[PDB]
Amino acid sequence: MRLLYLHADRFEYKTVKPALKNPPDPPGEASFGEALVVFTTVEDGDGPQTVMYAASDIASHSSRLKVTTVILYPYAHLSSRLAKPMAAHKRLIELEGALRTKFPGHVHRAPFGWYKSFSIACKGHPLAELSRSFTE
Amino acid sequence: MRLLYLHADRFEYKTVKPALKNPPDPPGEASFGEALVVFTTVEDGDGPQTVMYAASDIASHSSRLKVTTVILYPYAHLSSRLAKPMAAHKRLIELEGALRTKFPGHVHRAPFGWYKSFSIACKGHPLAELSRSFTE
Numbered sequence: 001m002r003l004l005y006l007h008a009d010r011f012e013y014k015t016v017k018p019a020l021k022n023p024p025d026p027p028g029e030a031s032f033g034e035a036l037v038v039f040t041t042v043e044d045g046d047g048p049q050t051v052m053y054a055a056s057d058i059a060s061h062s063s064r065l066k067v068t069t070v071i072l073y074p075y076a077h078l079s080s081r082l083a084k085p086m087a088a089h090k091r092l093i094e095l096e097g098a099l100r101t102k103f104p105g106h107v108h109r110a111p112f113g114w115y116k117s118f119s120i121a122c123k124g125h126p127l128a129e130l131s132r133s134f135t136e
Numbered sequence: 137m138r139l140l141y142l143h144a145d146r147f148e149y150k151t152v153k154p155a156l157k158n159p160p161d162p163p164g165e166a167s168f169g170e171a172l173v174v175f176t177t178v179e180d181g182d183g184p185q186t187v188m189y190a191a192s193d194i195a196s197h198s199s200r201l202k203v204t205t206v207i208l209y210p211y212a213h214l215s216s217r218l219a220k221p222m223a224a225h226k227r228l229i230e231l232e233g234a235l236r237t238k239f240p241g242h243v244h245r246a247p248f249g250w251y252k253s254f255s256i257a258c259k260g261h262p263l264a265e266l267s268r269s270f271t272e
């Protein structure tokens with residue numbers, strides 16, 4: 001799993017065209033205030049240990065940043081060892097679940113299998129943009 | 137070299153604190169309309185062949201997208217094989233130069249060695265977000 005942590009002042013996305021033949025999630029849109037936006041690329045090796053490691057780290061970083069909202073934003077472009085779409089959607093659902101056991105704020109999982117527009121206003125402080133890798 | 141191509145409706149950034157002890161570029165800020173925003177991570181293997189390959193591809197993609205502005209935005213987080221800061225700043229200056237020989241629109245190289253805030257409004261069309269790797 002490869003993650004990008006973006007500490008945002010605001011974030012919004014809207015699904016546009018379907019990326020996959022049958023996207024497993026419905027279309028939609030959402031917007032937020034201050035949040036940790038977690039661009040998430042699911043990799044071939046990822047299993048339950050990977051998910052839990054990622055859940056704990058996202059929780060800790062969020063604690064350190066004093067954020068109370070985390071967006072899990074599926075993203076295909078952070079690495080060159082992608083899992084297949086079915087496995088990735090399963091891992092992202094598991095990650096959402098795991099995070100809720102470690103982090104007490106709002107967790108929003110953005111829809112999987114869609115092309116999307118988004119806007120972010122990312123903070124410029126020292127810890128506002130960090131990458132993470134998890135494996136098992 | 138690892139790149140992320142984001143076809144933006146708008147983009148802006150502002151340098152905030154210095155990331156490096158002595159940033160090789162002055163501080164500043166800029167904003168744009170429709171542009172290809174190229175998040176650029178310079179990797180250990182990168183040399184002149186890498187730069188030219190990247191320049192040609194950025195030019196071609198930009199041609200395909202019908203954009204007339206390209207932002208070269210230094211970014212440390214797209215891979216786990218970073219070049220050192222001196223080499224990276226040199227390669228990014230070379231890339232800027234190379235791109236101007238292949239692409240006829242506005243090329244803006246954002247300042248290197250700074251923490252920055254940014255906002256983007258990324259389009260949601262099929263080709264609006266793509267990753268690229270170049271080597272030699």
Ligand SMILES: C[C@@H](O)[C@H](N)C(=O)N[C@H]1[C@@H](O)[C@H](n2cnc3c(N)ncnc32)O[C@@H]1CO
Pocket residue numbers: 019020040041042043074075076077082083084085088111112113114115116117260265
């Ligand atoms: C493209 C851009 O607008 C959008 N944001 C997008 O990237 N959409 C991705 C993810 O929602 C998802 N997806 C497929 N495989 C994976 C994977 N291994 N890991 C994470 N997501 C995946 O399916 C789409 C690409 O097939």
Ligand SMILES: C[C@@H](O)[C@H](N)C(=O)N[C@H]1[C@@H](O)[C@H](n2cnc3c(N)ncnc32)O[C@@H]1CO
Pocket residue numbers: 124129155156176177178179210211212213218219220221224247248249250251252253
């Ligand atoms: C952090 C975030 O707010 C900001 N956008 C940032 O990433 N700043 C980076 C780049 O400007 C640059 N830098 C250092 N090494 C590299 C490299 N190998 N490739 C590209 N840039 C580099 O130096 C800063 C990190 O040392």
Ligand SMILES: [Mg+2]
Pocket residue numbers: 014015027028029
């Ligand atoms: Mg809609």
Ligand SMILES: [Mg+2]
Pocket residue numbers: 150151163164165
């Ligand atoms: Mg300023």
